[PDB]
């Protein structure tokens, strides 16, 4: 009934194409490595032998490649075919990269929206997958019926770079959590195995994730006033001292140490952890 | 019907004493600052005018002070009264501090268990509060009926320092999460307020907390094999580059950058984030 053309059959691109094929769409695929990776022929995908063929296979083009440089290189010989196309670029990169690509594609007669896929491959099509989108609003509005088979859609405005800013923000959250998981699992390894420890760590991270809601309210009010910075810096020293005694690196908690120091210096020792928001500028 | 004696009426100690008084226990309290902080007289607590009186008020002594040095200083003039007492020390510190205090109190005829309170004051008495305990098992077994009015009880063995090791591990987890929350809320501040952003951040941290269960299974199996380290280091560079362009510090993610580098060098570029566990030793 309707069509789509996908660029990239890594793990994420393979999941987007599978899902369009389950939902009975006509699907063209461009595969970097057809010699070793599946082109999903069995499920009904049609192989795009060149980038030009991939652009001519549909007016709706979904790009999922390793980086924004690989986007420019893959399409360099096909800019003349972009007139009247809608481009959805889900390739990971920076807001600046997305503003420059948007400008280039619009100059060739195309409309552009960028996306951040907030999901693993296996989550694609489940109610837990989310994609953030920004750029051409007419383009998003006409494509949303198709894009909603992958994931919940969140459009957050006309700047082609807003979506990548939110994506990188959420990933810097994830890397903090993973830093915590690693420091914690290492410190305790000598006494309890990782899987048994998860019985204590997972509920505690759920309780402290709930506590961050409270901290966000403090940041928007500008409150901060009431355990405080002063008592928490002695808490951090204990973790460091215990870390060295287990022969475990403390590098992961050193940045938070530095920010808590800079804040007591400017007289914040009686305020909460929310107060650090002005010191990370 | 039964009794208890508490040392410390900071925010946490006040919550332990309140809770014992609601549950109809006879409660003695030692207060560092009776001139400015409540001694809970209204709810029926009795003020211990000296540390000796506090030790003689009950055979069950619960200590909740700022640090393990303040424990030694507060009780220095009362070591002769410890014979046949059960000491529960919930004061934050290192495993070594807890082994040394245990040895000292046992030499004076007392039994010793250390605790880590995994809770805010307001959580005390709720089904979400947890306390970790370690040291004298006869002492824990006789006290548990009383200690269970505060929180779930988890005893994890005879070493007086095991409880503090687990406590500091869980707090290093929390500080990773908070590092993530701060890096994320700052990066996006220019475009969306902290409270609105929580609509995206909280579900994403729940999804990635679930993903750590998978990583713990990989660490205990020694697996690691399958997005990999190589692609994630370019992901981290984007966050750094985007961070500098928003005038936001990237210090929080630099330690994870260093550990991911050391691991590709020893040929781990195709393995998962679980693989970093051997590099934090």
Coordinates of N, CA, C and O in Angstrom, one line a residue, chain B residues 18-174:
Chain B
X18 N 12.0 8.8 66.7 CA 10.5 9.0 66.4 C 9.8 7.6 66.2 O 8.8 7.3 66.9
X19 N 10.4 6.9 65.3 CA 9.9 5.5 64.9 C 9.9 4.6 66.1 O 8.8 4.0 66.4
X20 N 10.9 4.5 66.9 CA 10.9 3.6 68.2 C 9.8 4.1 69.1 O 9.1 3.3 69.7
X21 N 9.6 5.4 69.2 CA 8.5 6.0 70.1 C 7.1 5.7 69.6 O 6.3 5.4 70.4
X22 N 6.9 5.8 68.3 CA 5.6 5.4 67.7 C 5.2 4.0 68.0 O 4.1 3.6 68.2
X23 N 6.2 3.1 68.0 CA 6.1 1.6 68.2 C 6.1 1.3 69.7 O 6.3 0.1 70.0
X24 N 6.0 2.3 70.5 CA 5.8 2.2 72.0 C 7.0 1.6 72.8 O 6.8 1.0 73.8
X25 N 8.2 1.9 72.3 CA 9.4 1.5 73.0 C 9.8 2.5 74.1 O 9.3 3.7 73.9
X26 N 10.5 2.1 75.1 CA 11.1 3.1 76.1 C 12.3 3.6 75.4 O 13.1 2.8 75.0
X27 N 12.5 4.9 75.2 CA 13.6 5.4 74.3 C 14.4 6.5 75.1 O 13.8 7.5 75.5
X28 N 15.7 6.3 75.2 CA 16.7 7.3 75.7 C 17.4 7.9 74.5 O 17.6 7.2 73.5
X29 N 17.7 9.2 74.5 CA 18.3 9.9 73.4 C 19.5 10.7 73.9 O 19.3 11.5 74.9
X30 N 20.6 10.7 73.2 CA 21.8 11.6 73.4 C 21.9 12.5 72.2 O 22.0 12.0 71.0
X31 N 21.8 13.8 72.5 CA 21.6 14.9 71.5 C 22.9 15.8 71.7 O 23.1 16.4 72.7
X32 N 23.7 15.9 70.6 CA 24.9 16.8 70.5 C 24.5 18.3 70.8 O 25.4 18.9 71.5
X33 N 23.3 18.7 70.5 CA 23.0 20.2 70.5 C 21.6 20.4 71.1 O 20.6 20.8 70.4
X34 N 21.4 20.1 72.4 CA 20.1 20.1 73.0 C 19.5 21.6 73.1 O 18.3 21.7 73.3
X35 N 20.4 22.6 72.8 CA 20.0 24.0 73.0 C 19.2 24.5 71.7 O 18.4 25.4 71.9
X36 N 19.4 23.8 70.6 CA 18.8 24.2 69.3 C 18.0 23.1 68.6 O 17.1 23.4 67.9
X37 N 18.4 21.8 68.8 CA 17.6 20.7 68.2 C 16.7 20.0 69.2 O 17.1 19.8 70.4
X38 N 15.5 19.6 68.8 CA 14.5 18.9 69.6 C 15.1 17.6 70.3 O 15.7 16.9 69.6
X39 N 14.8 17.3 71.5 CA 15.2 16.1 72.2 C 13.9 15.1 72.2 O 13.9 14.2 73.0
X40 N 12.9 15.5 71.5 CA 11.6 14.6 71.3 C 11.0 14.4 72.6 O 10.3 13.3 72.8
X41 N 11.0 15.4 73.5 CA 10.5 15.3 74.9 C 9.0 15.0 74.7 O 8.4 14.1 75.4
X42 N 8.3 15.8 73.9 CA 6.8 15.7 73.7 C 6.4 14.3 73.3 O 5.2 14.0 73.7
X43 N 7.1 13.5 72.6 CA 6.7 12.2 72.1 C 7.1 11.1 73.2 O 6.9 10.0 72.9
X44 N 7.8 11.5 74.2 CA 8.2 10.7 75.4 C 9.6 10.2 75.5 O 9.9 9.4 76.4
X45 N 10.6 10.8 74.7 CA 12.0 10.4 74.9 C 12.5 11.0 76.2 O 12.1 12.1 76.6
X46 N 13.5 10.4 76.8 CA 14.3 10.8 78.0 C 15.7 11.3 77.6 O 16.4 10.5 77.0
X47 N 16.1 12.5 78.0 CA 17.4 13.0 77.6 C 18.5 12.4 78.4 O 18.5 12.5 79.6
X48 N 19.6 11.8 77.7 CA 20.8 11.3 78.4 C 21.8 12.5 78.5 O 22.3 12.9 77.5
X49 N 22.0 13.0 79.8 CA 22.8 14.2 80.1 C 24.3 13.9 79.9 O 25.0 14.8 79.6
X50 N 24.7 12.6 80.0 CA 26.1 12.2 79.6 C 26.1 10.9 78.8 O 25.0 10.3 78.8
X51 N 27.2 10.6 78.1 CA 27.4 9.3 77.4 C 27.2 8.1 78.3 O 26.6 7.1 77.9
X52 N 27.7 8.2 79.5 CA 27.6 7.1 80.6 C 26.1 6.8 80.8 O 25.7 5.6 80.7
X53 N 25.3 7.8 81.1 CA 23.8 7.7 81.2 C 23.2 7.0 80.0 O 22.3 6.1 80.2
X54 N 23.6 7.3 78.8 CA 23.1 6.8 77.5 C 23.4 5.3 77.4 O 22.5 4.6 77.0
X55 N 24.6 4.9 77.8 CA 25.0 3.5 77.8 C 24.3 2.7 78.9 O 23.9 1.6 78.7
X56 N 24.0 3.4 80.1 CA 23.3 2.7 81.2 C 21.7 2.7 80.9 O 21.1 1.9 81.6
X57 N 21.2 3.5 80.0 CA 19.8 3.5 79.8 C 19.2 2.3 79.2 O 18.0 2.0 79.3
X58 N 20.0 1.5 78.5 CA 19.5 0.2 77.8 C 20.7 -0.7 77.5 O 21.8 -0.2 77.4
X59 N 20.4 -2.0 77.3 CA 21.4 -2.9 76.8 C 21.5 -2.8 75.3 O 22.5 -3.3 74.7
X60 N 20.5 -2.3 74.6 CA 20.5 -2.1 73.1 C 20.8 -0.6 72.8 O 20.0 0.2 73.1
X61 N 22.0 -0.3 72.3 CA 22.5 1.0 72.0 C 22.6 1.1 70.5 O 23.3 0.3 69.9
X62 N 21.9 2.1 69.9 CA 21.9 2.4 68.4 C 22.6 3.7 68.2 O 22.3 4.7 68.8
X63 N 23.7 3.7 67.5 CA 24.6 4.9 67.3 C 24.3 5.4 65.8 O 24.5 4.6 64.9
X64 N 24.1 6.7 65.7 CA 23.9 7.4 64.4 C 24.5 8.8 64.5 O 23.8 9.7 64.8
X65 N 25.8 8.9 64.3 CA 26.6 10.2 64.5 C 27.2 10.5 63.1 O 27.0 9.8 62.2
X66 N 27.9 11.7 63.0 CA 28.4 12.2 61.7 C 29.5 11.3 61.2 O 29.4 11.0 60.0
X67 N 30.4 10.8 62.0 CA 31.6 10.0 61.5 C 32.1 9.1 62.6 O 31.7 9.3 63.8
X68 N 33.0 8.2 62.3 CA 33.5 7.1 63.2 C 34.4 7.7 64.3 O 34.4 7.3 65.5
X69 N 35.0 8.8 64.0 CA 35.8 9.6 64.9 C 34.9 10.3 66.0 O 35.3 10.3 67.2
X70 N 33.7 10.7 65.6 CA 32.8 11.3 66.6 C 32.2 10.2 67.5 O 31.9 10.5 68.7
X71 N 32.1 8.9 67.0 CA 31.8 7.8 67.8 C 32.8 7.6 69.0 O 32.4 7.4 70.1
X72 N 34.1 7.6 68.6 CA 35.2 7.3 69.6 C 35.3 8.4 70.6 O 35.4 8.1 71.8
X73 N 35.2 9.7 70.2 CA 35.2 10.9 71.1 C 34.0 10.9 72.0 O 34.2 11.2 73.2
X74 N 32.8 10.6 71.5 CA 31.6 10.6 72.3 C 31.6 9.6 73.5 O 31.1 9.9 74.6
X75 N 32.1 8.4 73.2 CA 32.1 7.3 74.2 C 33.4 7.1 74.9 O 33.4 6.2 75.8
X76 N 34.4 7.9 74.7 CA 35.8 7.8 75.3 C 35.8 7.8 76.8 O 36.6 7.0 77.4
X77 N 34.9 8.5 77.5 CA 34.7 8.5 78.9 C 33.8 7.5 79.5 O 33.4 7.7 80.7
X78 N 33.4 6.4 78.8 CA 32.4 5.5 79.2 C 32.7 4.0 78.8 O 31.8 3.2 78.9
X79 N 33.9 3.7 78.3 CA 34.3 2.4 77.9 C 34.1 1.3 79.0 O 33.8 0.2 78.7
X80 N 34.2 1.7 80.3 CA 34.0 0.9 81.5 C 32.6 0.4 81.6 O 32.3 -0.5 82.5
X81 N 31.6 1.0 80.9 CA 30.1 0.6 81.1 C 29.6 -0.3 80.0 O 28.4 -0.8 80.2
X82 N 30.5 -0.7 79.1 CA 30.1 -1.5 77.9 C 29.8 -3.0 78.1 O 29.3 -3.6 77.2
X83 N 30.3 -3.6 79.2 CA 30.2 -5.0 79.5 C 28.7 -5.5 79.3 O 27.8 -4.9 80.0
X84 N 28.5 -6.5 78.5 CA 27.2 -7.1 78.3 C 26.3 -6.3 77.4 O 25.1 -6.6 77.2
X85 N 26.7 -5.1 76.9 CA 25.9 -4.3 75.9 C 26.0 -4.8 74.5 O 27.0 -5.4 74.1
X86 N 24.9 -4.6 73.7 CA 24.9 -4.8 72.3 C 24.9 -3.5 71.6 O 24.0 -2.7 71.8
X87 N 25.9 -3.3 70.7 CA 26.1 -2.0 70.0 C 25.7 -2.2 68.5 O 26.2 -3.2 67.9
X88 N 24.8 -1.4 68.0 CA 24.5 -1.3 66.6 C 25.0 0.0 66.1 O 24.4 1.1 66.4
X89 N 26.1 0.1 65.3 CA 26.6 1.3 64.8 C 26.2 1.5 63.3 O 26.6 0.7 62.5
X90 N 25.3 2.5 63.1 CA 24.8 2.9 61.7 C 25.5 4.1 61.2 O 25.0 4.7 60.1
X91 N 26.5 4.6 61.9 CA 27.4 5.7 61.4 C 28.1 5.3 60.1 O 28.8 4.3 60.1
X92 N 28.0 6.2 59.1 CA 28.7 6.1 57.8 C 30.2 6.1 58.0 O 30.7 7.0 58.7
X93 N 30.9 5.1 57.4 CA 32.4 5.1 57.2 C 32.9 4.0 56.4 O 32.1 3.3 55.7
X94 N 34.2 3.7 56.5 CA 34.9 2.6 55.7 C 34.9 1.3 56.5 O 34.7 1.2 57.7
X95 N 35.0 0.1 55.7 CA 35.2 -1.2 56.4 C 36.3 -1.2 57.4 O 36.1 -1.9 58.5
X96 N 37.4 -0.6 57.2 CA 38.6 -0.6 58.1 C 38.1 0.0 59.5 O 38.3 -0.6 60.5
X97 N 37.5 1.2 59.4 CA 37.0 1.9 60.6 C 36.1 1.0 61.5 O 36.2 1.0 62.7
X98 N 35.2 0.2 60.8 CA 34.3 -0.7 61.5 C 35.0 -1.9 62.1 O 34.4 -2.5 63.1
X99 N 36.0 -2.4 61.5 CA 36.8 -3.6 62.0 C 37.5 -3.2 63.3 O 37.4 -3.9 64.3
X100 N 38.1 -1.9 63.3 CA 38.9 -1.4 64.5 C 37.9 -1.1 65.7 O 38.3 -1.5 66.8
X101 N 36.8 -0.4 65.4 CA 35.8 -0.1 66.4 C 35.2 -1.4 67.0 O 35.1 -1.6 68.2
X102 N 34.9 -2.4 66.1 CA 34.4 -3.7 66.6 C 35.4 -4.3 67.6 O 34.9 -4.7 68.7
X103 N 36.7 -4.3 67.3 CA 37.8 -4.9 68.1 C 37.9 -4.3 69.4 O 37.9 -5.0 70.5
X104 N 37.8 -2.9 69.4 CA 37.9 -2.1 70.6 C 36.7 -2.4 71.5 O 36.9 -2.6 72.7
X105 N 35.4 -2.4 71.0 CA 34.2 -2.6 71.8 C 34.2 -4.0 72.4 O 33.8 -4.2 73.6
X106 N 34.6 -5.1 71.6 CA 34.6 -6.5 72.0 C 35.6 -6.6 73.2 O 35.3 -7.4 74.2
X107 N 36.7 -6.0 73.1 CA 37.8 -6.0 74.2 C 37.2 -5.4 75.5 O 37.7 -5.7 76.5
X108 N 36.1 -4.7 75.4 CA 35.5 -4.0 76.7 C 34.2 -4.8 77.1 O 33.5 -4.3 78.0
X109 N 34.0 -6.0 76.5 CA 32.9 -6.9 76.9 C 31.6 -6.7 76.1 O 30.6 -7.3 76.6
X110 N 31.6 -5.9 75.1 CA 30.4 -5.6 74.2 C 30.3 -6.6 73.0 O 31.4 -7.2 72.7
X111 N 29.1 -6.7 72.4 CA 29.0 -7.3 71.1 C 28.7 -6.2 70.0 O 28.1 -5.2 70.5
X112 N 29.1 -6.4 68.8 CA 29.1 -5.3 67.8 C 28.5 -5.7 66.4 O 28.9 -6.8 65.9
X113 N 27.5 -5.0 65.9 CA 27.1 -5.1 64.5 C 27.1 -3.7 63.9 O 26.7 -2.7 64.6
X114 N 27.6 -3.6 62.7 CA 27.6 -2.3 61.9 C 26.4 -2.3 60.9 O 26.0 -3.5 60.5
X115 N 25.9 -1.2 60.6 CA 24.8 -1.0 59.6 C 25.1 0.1 58.6 O 25.7 1.1 59.0
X116 N 24.6 -0.1 57.4 CA 24.4 0.9 56.3 C 22.9 1.2 56.1 O 22.2 0.2 55.6
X117 N 22.5 2.4 56.4 CA 21.0 2.8 56.2 C 20.8 3.2 54.8 O 21.4 4.2 54.4
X118 N 20.1 2.4 54.0 CA 19.9 2.7 52.6 C 18.5 3.4 52.5 O 17.5 2.7 52.2
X119 N 18.5 4.7 52.8 CA 17.2 5.4 53.0 C 17.5 6.9 53.4 O 18.5 7.1 54.0
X120 N 16.6 7.8 53.0 CA 16.5 9.1 53.5 C 15.7 9.0 54.9 O 15.1 8.0 55.1
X121 N 15.8 10.0 55.7 CA 15.0 10.1 57.0 C 13.5 9.8 56.8 O 13.0 9.0 57.6
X122 N 12.9 10.4 55.8 CA 11.4 10.3 55.5 C 11.0 8.9 55.2 O 9.9 8.6 55.4
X123 N 11.9 8.1 54.7 CA 11.7 6.6 54.3 C 11.7 5.7 55.5 O 11.2 4.6 55.4
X124 N 12.2 6.2 56.6 CA 12.3 5.3 57.8 C 10.9 4.8 58.3 O 10.0 5.7 58.4
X125 N 10.7 3.5 58.4 CA 9.4 2.9 58.8 C 8.5 2.5 57.6 O 7.6 1.8 57.8
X126 N 8.9 2.9 56.4 CA 8.2 2.6 55.1 C 8.7 1.2 54.6 O 9.8 0.9 54.9
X127 N 7.9 0.5 53.8 CA 8.4 -0.7 53.2 C 9.6 -0.6 52.2 O 10.1 -1.6 51.8
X128 N 10.0 0.6 51.8 CA 11.1 0.9 50.8 C 12.4 1.1 51.5 O 13.5 1.0 50.8
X129 N 12.5 1.3 52.9 CA 13.8 1.5 53.6 C 14.4 0.1 53.8 O 13.8 -0.9 54.1
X130 N 15.8 0.1 53.6 CA 16.6 -1.1 53.8 C 17.8 -0.7 54.7 O 18.5 0.3 54.4
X131 N 18.2 -1.6 55.7 CA 19.5 -1.5 56.4 C 20.3 -2.7 56.2 O 19.8 -3.8 56.4
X132 N 21.6 -2.6 55.8 CA 22.5 -3.7 55.7 C 23.3 -3.9 57.0 O 23.6 -2.8 57.6
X133 N 23.4 -5.1 57.5 CA 24.1 -5.4 58.8 C 25.2 -6.5 58.7 O 25.0 -7.4 57.9
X134 N 26.2 -6.3 59.5 CA 27.3 -7.3 59.5 C 28.0 -7.3 60.9 O 28.1 -6.1 61.5
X135 N 28.6 -8.4 61.3 CA 29.3 -8.5 62.6 C 28.7 -9.6 63.4 O 28.3 -10.7 62.9
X136 N 28.5 -9.3 64.7 CA 28.1 -10.4 65.7 C 26.7 -11.0 65.3 O 25.7 -10.3 65.3
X137 N 26.6 -12.3 64.9 CA 25.4 -12.9 64.5 C 24.4 -13.2 65.6 O 23.2 -13.0 65.4
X138 N 24.9 -13.5 66.8 CA 24.0 -13.7 68.0 C 23.3 -12.3 68.3 O 22.1 -12.3 68.6
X139 N 24.1 -11.2 68.3 CA 23.6 -9.8 68.5 C 22.6 -9.4 67.5 O 21.5 -9.1 67.9
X140 N 22.9 -9.6 66.2 CA 21.9 -9.4 65.2 C 20.6 -10.2 65.4 O 19.5 -9.6 65.4
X141 N 20.7 -11.5 65.7 CA 19.6 -12.4 65.9 C 18.6 -11.9 67.0 O 17.4 -11.9 66.9
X142 N 19.2 -11.4 68.2 CA 18.4 -11.0 69.4 C 17.8 -9.6 69.2 O 16.8 -9.3 69.8
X143 N 18.4 -8.8 68.3 CA 18.1 -7.3 68.1 C 17.1 -7.2 66.9 O 16.5 -6.1 66.7
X144 N 16.9 -8.2 66.0 CA 16.3 -8.0 64.7 C 14.8 -7.6 64.8 O 14.3 -6.8 64.1
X145 N 14.1 -8.2 65.8 CA 12.7 -7.9 66.1 C 12.5 -6.4 66.4 O 11.5 -5.9 65.9
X146 N 13.5 -5.8 67.0 CA 13.5 -4.3 67.3 C 13.9 -3.6 66.0 O 13.2 -2.6 65.6
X147 N 15.0 -4.0 65.4 CA 15.6 -3.3 64.2 C 14.6 -3.3 63.0 O 14.5 -2.3 62.3
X148 N 13.7 -4.3 62.9 CA 12.8 -4.5 61.8 C 11.7 -3.4 61.9 O 10.9 -3.3 60.9
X149 N 11.5 -2.6 62.9 CA 10.4 -1.5 62.9 C 10.9 -0.4 62.0 O 10.1 0.4 61.6
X150 N 12.3 -0.3 61.8 CA 12.9 0.8 61.0 C 12.8 0.6 59.5 O 12.7 1.6 58.8
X151 N 12.9 -0.7 59.1 CA 13.3 -1.0 57.7 C 13.5 -2.5 57.5 O 13.6 -3.2 58.6
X152 N 13.4 -3.0 56.3 CA 13.9 -4.4 56.0 C 15.3 -4.5 56.5 O 16.1 -3.6 56.3
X153 N 15.6 -5.7 57.1 CA 17.0 -6.1 57.6 C 17.6 -7.1 56.7 O 17.1 -8.1 56.4
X154 N 18.9 -6.8 56.2 CA 19.7 -7.7 55.4 C 21.0 -7.9 56.2 O 21.8 -7.0 56.2
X155 N 21.2 -9.1 56.8 CA 22.5 -9.5 57.4 C 23.4 -10.2 56.4 O 23.0 -11.2 55.8
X156 N 24.6 -9.7 56.2 CA 25.4 -10.4 55.3 C 26.8 -10.8 55.9 O 27.8 -10.8 55.2
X157 N 26.8 -11.4 57.1 CA 28.0 -12.2 57.6 C 28.7 -11.5 58.8 O 28.3 -10.3 59.1
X158 N 29.7 -12.2 59.3 CA 30.4 -12.0 60.6 C 31.4 -10.9 60.6 O 31.8 -10.4 61.7
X159 N 32.0 -10.5 59.4 CA 33.0 -9.4 59.3 C 32.3 -8.1 59.5 O 31.3 -7.8 58.7
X160 N 32.7 -7.3 60.5 CA 32.1 -6.1 60.9 C 32.2 -5.0 59.8 O 31.6 -4.0 60.0
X161 N 32.9 -5.3 58.7 CA 33.2 -4.3 57.7 C 32.4 -4.6 56.4 O 32.4 -3.7 55.5
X162 N 31.8 -5.8 56.2 CA 31.1 -6.2 55.0 C 30.0 -5.2 54.7 O 29.8 -4.8 53.5
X163 N 29.2 -4.7 55.8 CA 28.1 -3.9 55.7 C 28.5 -2.5 55.1 O 27.8 -2.0 54.3
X164 N 29.6 -1.9 55.6 CA 30.1 -0.6 55.1 C 30.6 -0.7 53.7 O 30.4 0.2 52.9
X165 N 31.1 -1.9 53.3 CA 31.6 -2.1 51.9 C 30.4 -2.0 50.9 O 30.5 -1.3 49.9
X166 N 29.3 -2.7 51.2 CA 28.1 -2.7 50.4 C 27.5 -1.3 50.4 O 27.0 -0.9 49.3
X167 N 27.5 -0.6 51.5 CA 26.9 0.7 51.7 C 27.6 1.7 50.7 O 26.9 2.2 49.8
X168 N 28.9 1.8 50.8 CA 29.7 2.6 49.9 C 29.6 2.2 48.5 O 29.5 3.1 47.6
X169 N 29.5 0.9 48.2 CA 29.3 0.5 46.8 C 28.0 1.1 46.3 O 28.0 1.8 45.2
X170 N 26.9 1.0 47.0 CA 25.5 1.4 46.5 C 25.5 3.0 46.4 O 24.9 3.5 45.4
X171 N 26.3 3.7 47.2 CA 26.4 5.2 47.2 C 27.2 5.6 45.9 O 26.9 6.7 45.4
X172 N 28.2 4.8 45.5 CA 29.0 5.1 44.3 C 28.1 4.9 43.1 O 28.2 5.6 42.1
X173 N 27.2 3.9 43.2 CA 26.1 3.8 42.1 C 25.3 5.0 42.0 O 25.2 5.6 40.9
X174 N 24.7 5.5 43.1 CA 23.9 6.7 43.3 C 24.7 7.9 42.7 O 24.0 8.7 41.9

